[PDB]
Each structure stands twice: as structure tokens, then as C-alpha cells.
């Protein structure tokens, strides 16, 4: 063990949590990703998700902060569902609720009346094939005004998908319910693959972890094969590739940390760990956050297979005319990239 490198874990997790804690807003939200004249910046999305990754902190100023989200969460009452969404102006979404419901644990009101109301409300997305679906039509249809989406198909936005199933699954009252959809929907290399993601890693650990927190013996091959993947997917050099970041996500490479924590035995496993751990801390920016690289995509609102579009172009990147749909944003505050990492790396320092 290089005590060096465990000094370094604690000095770089601690300029990350000071980076994120001096970048909330006027009220203390978490605010990242933009949709320009439209959608605008999320808020409760983001607070709910980085609060949630911040609960692994034993710090007393971080307890108080998730306190605080929570607070801020249970101000945003407006909508009658009792759910919440990407922002204000957006109608509830499964996705923003169920991180909202794992910071309400980490506060210790997941028996809260609000909890219990955005859980029942959770239980309207659940799909005949056994998965959730981020939007119900009606909420979604109502808030967009887009002439060319008025007559569309939004069964792609409305149906099942992998990515809000997995997070919804680490709510202890849906992880049974859930089950059957997250085992059958395995790819065959291993890997999940999400909706609203690029990065199957994120998709691909947050199941693995509904997985292993279910604790049946069943689900252990599939566990075993989804680390196998990110075993895969690490490179030497302690990072994961993508076509956009060929010498390494900080995104992705931080959710396959996670997924690696699920075997603690496997030599090979504890040496990747290590190797995307080093690659981590030479890659965190002066301010103690990361890179940003959580890419958010949005398909059309009638495609049940994002995984199948080969047109995705970054919205940033676009010259002229452009829509949402078919593009990626970005998290251009780098809160939820650096909250990820951070959360990934106070995980993982034990096993070092
Ligand atoms: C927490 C979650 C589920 C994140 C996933 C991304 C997500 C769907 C954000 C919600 C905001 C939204 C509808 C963005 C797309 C959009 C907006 C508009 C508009 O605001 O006018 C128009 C579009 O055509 C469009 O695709
Ligand atoms: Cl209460
Ligand atoms: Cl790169
Ligand atoms: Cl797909
Ligand atoms: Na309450
Ligand atoms: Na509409």
C-alpha cells in the first residue's frame, strides 16, 4: 500500500467536494446542463444526483449540504404527482424522482409524506414489460411546443429504459419488481445499454449494483459477466476509451470504477482499480474538479433504440440551424462529472 497514494485520494476527494460545495446557487442548488432558449439548466435533477453521490462522504459539512438539497427538493411541491423533474418548468420524470427518493435515504426521509408521494407516483411509469419509463405521454406532450413533435410518436421518450430502470432499482421497494426487466435486458457481451446515455458503463454498474444489492445468488454470473466488461473496457493505462475521448472519459471511466468495486477477490480487478484510481488523480484540474464528460443525448421522441442512431452530433459542435434531437449536451459546469468521479473514488479507496 502506497500511503502516498492513499494522501492523495484524501487531498484530491476533498479539493473535489470544495469545488462542488462553492458551486451551488443563490438558493444552494446543484445546476448543470443547458438546453438553450428552451429547457434551460437542470436543478433538480442535478442536486438530487450529486447529493446522492455525495452521501458517501463521513463528513458533517456534506451531511449538512444533502440536508439542504433535500429541503430545496421538498420546496419544489408544484407539481399535483408529488414527482420532480429536470427543472422546474418540466413536468416529473422517473429519472429526477428516483435519485430524489435515494438523497431522501441518505437524509433519513425516505418515510417522509413527500417520499412516500413521489414513490406511489413512481409506480404510474412501471411498463407491461416490467421496466420504467422516464415521461408519462400526456406531461411530456403538454410541456413541449414544437410544431414538427405535435403529431410524433413519443413511445420512444415513454417507454422502458435501462438506464432510469437501474437507478429506480436501487430503491429497496422497487428492486423486486424491477428484476426480470434488468436480467433480460443483459446484452450478450455483458453490458446493459441506457436511453438517455452514451456511456453503457453508467447503465452498466448502476444495474450491476441493483443487482448485487438484491443479494440472490442467481444474479451473481450476471454481475461476474458485467465486470468483465469493464474489465474490458479499462484500458492499461487506467482509463476507458470513447470514440469522443480516445485517451480516456473521466465519465465513463469513473462509472466503470464503480462497476469494478463489485468483485473484491480477482486479482486483475484490484490491479484496474488501482491503475483507473492513478489515472483519475493525474487527471483532476487544478479547482479539484474534472473534465466534463457526462453526455446527455436526446433521441427523437418516437426512437425506442438510441443505441441504434449513428447520427449523433454534439450540440455544441453543430454550425447553423440545429435541434435537440439527434444531438448531446454536456454538463458544462462539470458538477455532475466531477460529483461522479468523486463518489467513485471514496468507494474505491478501501479496496486499494
Ligand atoms: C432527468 C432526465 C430524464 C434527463 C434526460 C434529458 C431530458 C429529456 C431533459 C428534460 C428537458 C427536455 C424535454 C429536453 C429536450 C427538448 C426540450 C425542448 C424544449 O424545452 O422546448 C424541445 C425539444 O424538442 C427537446 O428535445
Ligand atoms: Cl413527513
Ligand atoms: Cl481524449
Ligand atoms: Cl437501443
Ligand atoms: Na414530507
Ligand atoms: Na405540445
Known sequence: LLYPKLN????????????????RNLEGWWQDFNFPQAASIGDEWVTAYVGTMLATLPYAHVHEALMQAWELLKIRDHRPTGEWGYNYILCGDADTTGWALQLAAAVGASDSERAQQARAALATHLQPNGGIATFAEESIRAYIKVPDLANVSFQGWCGAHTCVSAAVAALPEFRSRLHDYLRVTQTSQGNWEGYWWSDHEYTTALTAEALAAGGQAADQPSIEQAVAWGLKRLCPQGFVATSKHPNGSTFATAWCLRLLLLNTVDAEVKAARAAAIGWLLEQQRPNGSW????????????????????????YDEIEGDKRFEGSIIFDHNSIFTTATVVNSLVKAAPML
Open 8 to 23: 492523495q485520494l484524501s487531498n484530491s476527494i476533498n479539493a473535489a467536494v470544495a469545488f462542488l460545495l462553492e458551486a
Open 291 to 314: 473534465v466534463s464528460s457526462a453526455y446527455l443525448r436526446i433521441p427523437y421522441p418516437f426512437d425506442r433504440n438510441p443505441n441504434q442512431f449513428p447520427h449523433w452530433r454534439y
